[PDB]
Design a protein around this ligand. Structure first.
Ligand code: CLA
Ligand code: CLA
Ligand code: CLA
Ligand code: CLA
Ligand code: CLA
Ligand code: CLA
Ligand code: CLA
Ligand code: CLA
Ligand SMILES: CCCCCCCCCCCCCCCC(=O)OC[C@H](COP(=O)(O)OC[C@@H](O)CO)OC(=O)CCCCCCCCCCCCCCC
Ligand SMILES: CC1=C(/C=C/C(C)=C/C=C/C(C)=C/C=C/C=C(C)/C=C/C=C(C)/C=C/C2=C(C)CCCC2(C)C)C(C)(C)CCC1
Ligand code: SF4
Ligand code: SF4
Lengths: 75, 144, 64, 37, 165, 40, 733, 80
């Protein structure tokens, strides 16, 4: 059970880290109703960079549906 | 050793009852009775579901099919180290005894038994299905 | 004085055996005139997990 | 001469879809259940 | 040209396709700044798109009415008209690697059959031996042929188990 | 350390390293030679 | 004990419901009946064949009767281009008024169904013009059905039962069937075309009342008996001929024009007359090959015994095969299904590209249904061909009498055969699926120019050899200087070349990279289905996991959980698994045929050329795009004539999904559930007064596989039939 | 009733008899093996076809074989 808890913390840490480094959270706070949350960015290889969509805030990335932006704002 | 005679008045274990017991088959075709001696009162598991307490001394149970009787026999023999025997009872009142057929459990070799359905060859020496064709019925090469 | 020597390698010739055309090590040979005296052991188990089997004198031949 | 009457479907559709199946099922059910002498 | 196809460099539909893809990228570009991170990424994509369409035309591929490159597989037609690089040359490129992988694995499998416990050498790989066999596989076509001629490539029919028949 | 290097030699660990290496090589080749369709 | 089934005492003694199910399922396995002898086996089969023949002619009679009674044949013949044929009338008391109005069409009295079987075009082509023509045919075939039924009864009677040796006279039966059944029937059919069909196509009525006083050709039999047979090919129907009328018509009765009638877009009648006359001569001649009571001809045993290669490459050769084939009915049935199954595919391939019936091409729904119909029937027959080949090995194969011949040697290298079929299936699947997925990723990322499109040069090269000049190969018939082009330039090439280079017809459609991928998927289907069926036959007699499988029969549940588990180990189960792959293969074939033709029929062939190279195009542009009208047959606003196909479409999905239940969940779960139902009934007051006579039990292991496969197949067929007809008919019809 | 046959490769291990959940099999004296005993199938009318005996046989191929045959109340394992 300690191993399961340790894995969740790595997973939770990754979600918070990717919000800090690969997200448009700061832009989202200013214009929450027009900017789509995004916290994942893909590398430009084999033409997969098209998955970096136009989400708003001068940012390109995959739109997320996990609701982490709303949770962070509430806290 | 002589064939035991069933005693219908033998006491039965302390059991509340369940819905997994005998059905209308017992009243029309047959049912099975298992009897044994108990050294002390103990709790055992009914093959039909639930737990029952065996009285000290003779015990008797009735089951719907043979496999249920021999399933209880395995429990009593292996765990509680008893020696049960069961019968086949017909609605007309006839009682047929079996297991142990000759008084000795089949796992142990006993003189006087006659081999049955024994082929003095290997599986690979059976004839081909074509050679047992049109024999009046579907017959495997192993039968002949 | 009957059958191959203990520990020698033999090739199985029973078509219905899992080890047909395969090499095994002779463990013992019964001298009581039984139907299948030769006992052979194999390094690879069959579908039932067994690695030993009994064979008749004419069902086993020396390696090559 | 060949043309059937204009009312033929009204009789044959119920006859072959509701009546004959009922008799056929009753015939088959009795037959399979019948015991040998 | 071949089978009614035309060189992509001379194909009208092929040229129009490039404009469509660049136009799509340009449309997204004008919603960003000149030197912002999204703008730089989009410009990089457009450069690769232009390079890709130049390379395929320069390679002398054939385009259909769809205006997309089509490949020639017949060795005679490929060598006749200089399309050997589409399928023919890559055919012998793959087989060398495929035989390399298969030959190396077969050498390792034979090597451990001599060991006391071959099964434990398969779940737990003998890395020093595997690396040794990995490098020697570069000459597999030579070694493979010599085994065939010496008759040690195949097992004897009498040493292979078969079911009753 | 002998046992630890034995653990790294187990099939799942070797496959992970091998495919991580194999995938990386293919990814890097396509990074420096993007869009290869014909040998040319 | 129970009477039913009378042919098996084992079943009749069973007290459970398995007796009812198994009695039905073993009725026609005569070899397994109690007291069966070889002679009685052949006489029952002979009688059963008369019953099948009578059903076929009665089924045909019913079609003729209903079209005449309720169809619009006489109206359709006037304007076949712009009239939908009527199959039969509808009398459904469950219909509401909107439904009655919706299905009223074609100027009919009431609701009717539109025909899709093409019998209108077929019957119109062969000379039928009025409803009375169909009525007389219907009564004639009903009479023929009765006669065959009587013959089935007659040859079961004490003095008319053939002996066992009669059924095994191979030389005499082949002589009669080749010369009489094939040759004379084709010669007679030539008579109909010369005397009836062709004149009717030129506006001249010929019937039983006047055909003896009408001359098929202006020169009556003088050219025939004088050897001047070319006189019959002079003055053929001109390109301006209007079918069924005398304007633009000719006089020839035997020609080799080689093309399509310009108006009807179908084969000329004078070519189909010369075709049947030609093969009739060949078949009548070919029927004088074998020995009979007259001291000339071959004996088939001698031919087989001779053909042994001197080098011993085929071992004993064909020695002993005559008895192997002549004594086994499963060997003969396997050869019959394999041959007939292949010919059924050939019919589908050639009928869509060489339409023989007038105005068949323009009826898109009919063409789609006819091709799908026969390809699915061919697929089932092929699976049966291998099933009975597997049954032959278990039941009829005798190793001693086939020692060292070709058949025995097939079992010798069965692992080699199966291993190589396995390799081909894996190779085709890996690379066929891989290229499709590659093209899908390229389309998803917006780079359609990066996908792998391989030109079908080998198939496009064949089309060049036949005269298709699009690809510029200038090969054989595509080159005007080749001897092949010159020699045929006066007989059939002008018509053939004109048709093959017309891109609006289905004669050698243009192919591209989209056709390359689909064809290789078809090869995967054929090889994998063969792999499953071939393994089921070669391993039928035994395997390492079950060395003595022959002792258990063709169909048994399993050998138990021992030795690792033996589920689906019988040869019956190999066939059962192969049916899934057959449906999958025929599905790919019929999707490919349908989509390539819908785009042609709409004129936008570019859609198939562009969207067929990746699998999203199929799902988007074929399945999803063409379902729009089907699923709107009935909606919250109303319904239209397609509501029956909309209803049948969901009906198919339900039967298909129900089949999953019998295939996924197995017996042990259900038998224990039924035991509580037995308990509940006995303890319920006022219901335990009633009781059963057959003890309820779960379906058997083998039965549920068949029941699950039957639901799977039925749902498969009904779903696509509704979609195929609805998408094609609504779009154009 | 199912068919159960014992073949002469039996080594008299008794495992088939122990495994059988309906007392169909038994051991009898024999002279064809070291154990001097052979399996027997005197009560096949009670056999249900579970094939637990075949699972327990060590010999290869099996020395005890079960051929499922005609069904009945006993062989179908019904208690109703
Ligand atoms: C649930 C855990 C989780 C998951 C699924 C991911 C997934 C990802 N991370 Mg993240 N990350 C996580 C936790 C996680 N991260 C944590 C806890 C940290 C803190 C150390 C980071 C720090 C981190 C960095 C610094 C980067 C990523 C990046 C990536 C991406 C590429 C990874 C890769 O291929 O590396 C290479 C593979 C191997 C070395 C093997 C990928 C979407 C990269 C990215 O998104 O770049 C745009 C990137 O730069 N992650
Ligand atoms: C196997 C051939 C076949 C088939 C599949 C059908 C099918 C159909 N027939 Mg037809 N029919 C056939 C042959 C066939 N018929 C023949 C040969 C005759 C001439 C006697 C008829 C005379 C006939 C009539 C008079 C009617 C139908 C009708 C029908 C429909 C409902 C079933 C019914 O009432 O049958 C009835 C079948 C018979 C009376 C003859 C059965 C003969 C065999 C040997 C028994 C259905 C579309 C009904 C319809 O059109 O409803 C809209 C209807 O009223 N059929
Ligand atoms: C070809 C087969 C067939 C036929 C002919 C019918 C016919 C009918 N069905 Mg349908 N039905 C069928 C198959 C068929 N069904 C099947 C297979 C199912 C299961 C999927 C159903 C399920 C079903 C339901 C659930 C319902 C119908 C109903 C109806 C009626 C609709 C029309 C109406 O308004 O009646 C109005 C009916 C009358 C005015 C009375 C008609 C005559 C009655 C029913 C019998 C009279 C008997 C007579 C007095 C004595 C015996 C005479 C006999 C010996 C000759 C009609 C009687 C509806 C209905 O009303 O049923 C009663 C209805 O609710 N059917
Ligand atoms: C997979 C089978 C296959 C098929 C269907 C074809 C088909 C074709 N090939 Mg190819 N070819 C193949 C495999 C195949 N090839 C292989 C494995 C090789 C060796 C690596 C070649 C080597 C080859 C050469 C060198 C040439 C062709 C050519 C051709 C074309 C005409 C001659 C021909 O091969 O006729 C049908 C094919 C066969 C019966 C199979 C064997 C073909 C042999 C190997 C080549 C025959 C060349 C021929 C004598 C050239 C005469 C001059 C020509 C202009 C008429 C035709 C499109 C010729 C071409 O370019 O025509 C435009 C040509 O010059 N092929
Ligand atoms: C049958 C399977 C199949 C085939 C034949 C190909 C073939 C190809 N794919 Mg595709 N692909 C496939 C399946 C397949 N794909 C699948 C299943 C997917 C989904 C995951 C993709 C997704 C995909 C993408 C996203 C891309 C490709 C690309 C490519 C190209 C790669 C060339 C390369 O890396 O050269 C590298 C050169 C080498 C020599 C590699 C081998 C190195 C060794 C060491 C050489 C040794 C020589 C002695 C090539 C045309 C790329 C492309 O541009 O295609 C046009 C590309 O971007 N594929
Ligand atoms: C000239 C004599 C003669 C004739 C005409 C027949 C005829 C027949 N015999 Mg044979 N038979 C003969 C002599 C003859 N026999 C002799 C001498 C013996 C003793 C040795 C036998 C012993 C014998 C047996 C034991 C059996 C037969 C059977 C049959 C029937 C086979 C099924 C069938 O109808 O196929 C019809 C087949 C065709 C018309 C040809 C099919 C192949 C073509 C190429 C298909 C395509 C054609 C065309 C394009 C289709 C157009 C379709 C249309 C919709 C447009 C058939 C009626 C079987 C039967 O059914 O008995 C009741 C049977 O069991 N015969
Ligand atoms: C002319 C060809 C022909 C002939 C004469 C036979 C004859 C025979 N076959 Mg063979 N067979 C054939 C074609 C043929 N087969 C084909 C085409 C296939 C592939 C599908 C097979 C596959 C096959 C197998 C797998 C087996 C046989 C077996 C048999 C034997 C027993 C049949 C039996 O009892 O059926 C009894 C019939 C049934 C239980 C019902 C059949 C109908 C099925 C389940 C489909 C029903 C669909 C339904 C009507 C749809 C309703 C739709 C709804 C909307 C209303 C018998 C000798 C069996 C045998 O004993 O072989 C030794 C056997 O194991 N055949
Ligand atoms: C879509 C469903 C599907 C698929 C993909 C397959 C695929 C296969 N079947 Mg199966 N089959 C199916 C349904 C399917 N079947 C059904 C419904 C039945 C009825 C029970 C059967 C019954 C059946 C039988 C009886 C047989 C097959 C056989 C085969 C093989 C045919 C050859 C082939 O294509 O090799 C190429 C292989 C494939 C296309 C398989 C998929 C490969 C994927 C894409 C690889 C992905 C790898 C990648 C690195 C990702 C991994 C991720 C993971 C680690 C998380 C293949 C493995 C035959 C066989 O085994 O021949 C050797 C065979 O005998 N099938
Ligand atoms: C450069 C010139 C090279 C000439 C090579 C000639 C090889 C002849 C075949 C020997 C082959 C050989 O050793 O045959 C031996 C064996 C025939 O067995 P038999 O027992 O009947 O005959 C043994 C003989 O060796 C002596 O009778 O056939 C095969 O194994 C394959 C037969 C292929 C048959 C091919 C038919 C023709 C197809 C078209 C081929 C193109 C046309 C030209 C070639 C025929
Ligand atoms: C298992 C088994 C079986 C079965 C089998 C089968 C089912 C098979 C099938 C098979 C098949 C199904 C096959 C097929 C084949 C085919 C072919 C082989 C073809 C050929 C062709 C050709 C050769 C052609 C040519 C040509 C062309 C191409 C063009 C022009 C014209 C001509 C003619 C020249 C039996 C019964 C025996 C029994 C035993 C076992
Ligand atoms: S049949 Fe098998 S398990 Fe039973 S006694 Fe013989 S060897 Fe032992
Ligand atoms: S099949 Fe089951 S009941 Fe029959 S002998 Fe074997 S173990 Fe006993």
């Amino acid at each position: 059970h300690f191993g399961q808890l340790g894995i969740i913390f790595i997973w939770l840490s990754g979600m918070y880290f990717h919000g800090a480094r690969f997200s448009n959270y700061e832009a989202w706070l200013s214009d929450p109703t027009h900017i789509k949350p995004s916290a994942q960015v893909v590398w430009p290889i084999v033409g997969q960079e098209i998955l970096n969509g136009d989400v708003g805030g001068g940012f390109q990335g995959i739109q997320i549906t996990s609701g982490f932006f709303q949770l962070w704002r509430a806290s | 050793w002589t064939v035991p005679t069933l005693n219908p008045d033998t006491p039965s274990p302390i059991f509340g009852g369940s819905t997994g017991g005998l059905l209308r088959k017992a009243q029309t075709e047959e049912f099975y009775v298992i009897t044994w001696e108990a050294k002390k009162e103990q709790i055992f598991e009914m093959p039909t579901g639930g737990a029952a307490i065996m009285r000290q001394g003779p015990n008797l149970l009735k089951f719907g099919k043979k496999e249920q009787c021999l399933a209880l026999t395995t429990q009593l023999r292996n765990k509680f180290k008893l020696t049960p025997c069961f019968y086949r009872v017909f609605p007309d009142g006839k009682v047929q005894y079996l297991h142990p057929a000759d008084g000795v459990y089949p796992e142990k070799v006993n003189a006087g038994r006659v081999g049955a359905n024994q082929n003095m060859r290997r599986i690979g020496q059976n004839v081909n299905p074509i050679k047992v064709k049109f024999s009046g019925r579907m017959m495997s090469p192993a039968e002949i | 004085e009957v059958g191959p020597k203990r520990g020698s390698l033999v090739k199985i010739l029973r078509p219905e055996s899992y080890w047909f055309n395969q090499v095994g090590k002779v463990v013992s040979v019964d001298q009581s005139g039984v139907r299948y005296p030769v006992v052979v052991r194999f390094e690879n188990q069959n579908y039932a997990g067994v690695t030993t089997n009994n064979y008749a004198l004419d069902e086993v031949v020396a390696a090559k | 001469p060949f043309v059937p009457p204009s009312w033929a479907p009204s009789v044959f559709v119920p006859l072959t879809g509701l009546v004959l199946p009922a008799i056929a099922m009753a015939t088959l059910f009795v037959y399979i259940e019948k015991e040998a002498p | 040209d071949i089978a009614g196809l035309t060189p992509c460099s001379e194909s009208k539909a092929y040229a129009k396709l490039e404009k469509k893809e660049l136009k799509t990228l340009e449309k997204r570009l004008k919603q960003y700044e000149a030197d912002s991170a999204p703008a730089v990424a989009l410009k990089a994509t457009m450069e690769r798109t232009k390079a890709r369409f130049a390379n395929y035309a320069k390679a002398g591929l054939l385009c259909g009415n769809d205006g997309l490159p089509h490949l020639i597989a017949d060795p005679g037609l490929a060598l006749k008209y200089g399309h050997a690089g589409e399928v023919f040359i890559p055919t012998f490129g793959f087989l060398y690697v495929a035989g390399y992988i298969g030959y190396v694995g077969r050498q390792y499998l034979i090597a451990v059959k001599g060991e006391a416990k071959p099964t434990d050498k398969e779940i737990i790989i003998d890395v020093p031996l595997a690396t040794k066999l990995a490098w020697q596989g570069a000459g597999w076509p030579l070694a493979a042929v010599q085994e065939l001629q010496r008759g040690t490539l195949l097992e004897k029919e009498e040493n292979i188990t078969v079911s009753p028949r | 350390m002998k046992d630890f290097t034995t653990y790294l030699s187990t099939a799942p660990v070797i496959a992970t390293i091998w495919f991580t290496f194999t995938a990386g090589l293919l990814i890097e080749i396509n990074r420096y030679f993007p869009d290869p369709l014909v040998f040319s | 004990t129970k009477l039913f089934p009378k042919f098996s005492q084992g079943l009749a003694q069973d007290p459970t419901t398995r007796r009812i199910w198994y009695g039905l399922a073993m009725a026609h396995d005569f070899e397994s009946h109690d007291g069966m002898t070889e002679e009685n086996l052949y006489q029952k089969i002979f009688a059963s064949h008369f019953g099948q023949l009578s059903i076929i002619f009665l089924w045909t009679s019913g079609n003729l009767f209903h079209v005449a009674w309720q169809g619009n044949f006489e109206q359709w013949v006037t304007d076949p281009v712009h009239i939908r044929p009527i199959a039969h009338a509808i009398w459904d008391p469950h219909f509401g008024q909107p439904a009655v109005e919706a299905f009223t069409r074609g100027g009919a009295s009431g609701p009717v169904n539109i025909s899709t079987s093409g019998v209108y075009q077929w019957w119109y082509t062969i000379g039928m013009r009025t409803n009375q023509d169909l009525y007389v045919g219907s009564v004639f075939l009903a009479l023929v059905s009765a006669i065959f039924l009587f013959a089935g009864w007659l040859h079961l009677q004490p003095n008319f039962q053939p002996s066992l040796s009669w059924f095994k006279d191979a030389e005499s039966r082949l002589n009669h069937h080749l010369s009489g059944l094939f040759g004379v029937s084709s010669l007679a059919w030539t008579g109909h075309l010369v005397h009836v069909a062709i004149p009717e196509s030129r506006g001249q009525h010929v019937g039983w009342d006047n055909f003896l006083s009408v001359l098929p050709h202006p020169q009556g039999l003088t050219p025939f008996f004088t050897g001047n047979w070319a006189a019959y090919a002079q003055s053929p129907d001109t390109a301006s001929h209007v079918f069924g009328t005398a304007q633009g018509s000719g006089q020839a009765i035997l020609t080799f024009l080689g093309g399509f009638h310009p108006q009807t877009q179908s084969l000329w009648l004078t070519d189909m007359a010369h075709h049947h006359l030609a093969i009739a001569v060949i078949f009548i001649v070919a029927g004088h090959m074998y020995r009979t009571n007259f001291g000339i001809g071959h004996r088939m045993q001698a031919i087989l015994e001779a053909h042994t290669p001197p080098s011993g490459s085929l071992g004993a050769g064909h020695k002993g095969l005559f008895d192997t084939v002549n004594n086994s009915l499963h060997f003969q049935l396997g050869l019959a299904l394999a041959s007939v199954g292949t010919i059924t595919s050939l019919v589908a391939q050639h009928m869509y590209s060489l339409p023989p019936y007038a105005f068949q091409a323009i009826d898109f729904t009919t063409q789609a249904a006819l091709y799908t119909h026969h390809q699915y029937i061919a697929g089932f027959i092929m699976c049966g061909a291998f099933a009975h080949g597997a049954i032959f090995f278990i039941r009829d194969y005798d190793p001693e009498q086939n020692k060292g011949n070709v058949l025995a040697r097939m079992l010798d290298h069965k692992e080699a055969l199966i291993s190589h079929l396995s390799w081909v299936s894996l190779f085709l699947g890996f690379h066929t699926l891989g290229l499709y997925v590659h093209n899908d990723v390229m389309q998803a990322f917006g780079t359609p120019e990066k996908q792998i499109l391989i030109e079908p040069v080998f198939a496009q090269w064949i089309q060049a050899a036949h005269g298709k000049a699009l690809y510029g190969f200038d090969f054989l018939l595509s080159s005007k200087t080749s001897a092949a082009f010159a020699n045929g330039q006066s007989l059939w090439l002008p018509g053939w070349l004109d048709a093959i280079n017309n891109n609006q017809n289905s004669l050698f459609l243009t192919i591209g990279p989209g056709d390359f991928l689909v064809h290789h998927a078809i090869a995967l289907g054929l090889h994998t289905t063969t792999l499953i069926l071939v393994k089921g036959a070669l391993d039928a007699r035994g395997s390492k996991l079950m060395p003595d499988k022959k002792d258990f029969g063709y169909s048994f549940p399993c050998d138990g959980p021992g030795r690792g588990g033996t589920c689906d180990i019988s040869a019956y189960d190999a066939f059962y698994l192969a049916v899934f792959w057959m449906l999958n293969t025929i599905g790919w074939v019929t999707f490919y045929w349908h989509w390539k033709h819908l785009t042609l029929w709409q004129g936008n062939v570019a859609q198939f050329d562009e969207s067929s190279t990746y699998l999203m195009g199929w799902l988007r542009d074929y399945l999803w795009l063409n379902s729009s009208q089907l699923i709107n047959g009935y909606n919250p606003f109303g319904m239209n004539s397609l509501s029956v196909w909309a209803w049948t479409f969901l009906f198919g999905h339900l039967i298909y999904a129900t089949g999953f239940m019998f295939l996924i969940s197995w017996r042990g779960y259900w038998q224990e559930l039924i035991e509580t139902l037995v308990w509940a009934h006995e303890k319920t007051p006022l219901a335990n007064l009633v009781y059963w006579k057959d003890k309820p039990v779960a379906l058997s292991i083998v039965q549920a596989r068949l029941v699950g496969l039957a639901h799977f197949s039925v749902g498969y067929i009904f779903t696509y039939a509704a979609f195929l007809i609805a998408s094609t008919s609504g779009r154009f019809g | 009733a199912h068919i159960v046959k014992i073949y002469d490769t039996c080594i008299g291990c008794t495992q088939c008899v122990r495994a059988c959940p309906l007392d169909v099999l038994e051991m009898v004296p024999w002279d064809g093996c070291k154990a001097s005993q052979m399996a027997s199938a005197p009560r096949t009318e009670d056999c249900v076809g579970c094939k637990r005996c075949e699972t327990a046989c060590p010999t290869d191929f099996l020395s005890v074989r079960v051929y499922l045959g005609s069904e009945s109340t006993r062989s179908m394992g019904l208690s109703y």
